[PDB]
Design a protein around this ligand. Structure first.
Ligand SMILES: NS(=O)(=O)c1cc2c(cc1Cl)N[C@H]([C@H]1C[C@H]3C=C[C@@H]1C3)NS2(=O)=O
Lengths: 10, 49, 49
């Protein structure tokens, strides 16, 4: 499936 | 991308080396990122304040 | 576009029908225009006033 990368930032 | 080894790292490095398919994240669209990955039109407006 | 005929009249129609190469123009990036012609990233930010 599609992998969503992201950063931990509010 | 750290020139030292011209290795893109972080969220860009997951996209260039294919371990992640998309980066829906607060990522600033800049010139050096255009050379290896393609952005959509920018969803959020921001400026230095 | 034309009224249920899809003949684009405007600066889009000079692009979509092979007449012009590029529109360096005040042209809104919208959804339907994206499907028929390409856009760059925006050079001006604005809204309905
Ligand atoms: N509300 S906001 O400031 O987050 C915001 C910011 C922007 C929006 C829409 C909203 Cl709601 N749309 C534009 C987009 C719509 C089309 C025109 C320019 C791009 C493609 N990007 S933007 O100018 O970055």
């Amino acid at each position: 499936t599609v992998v969503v990368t992201t950063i931990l930032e509010s | 991308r750290d020139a030292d080894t011209k290795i893109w790292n972080g969220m860009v490095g997951e996209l260039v080396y294919g371990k992640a398919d998309i980066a829906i994240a607060p990522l600033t669209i800049t010139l050096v990122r255009e050379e290896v990955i393609d952005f959509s039109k920018p969803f959020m407006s921001l400026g230095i304040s």
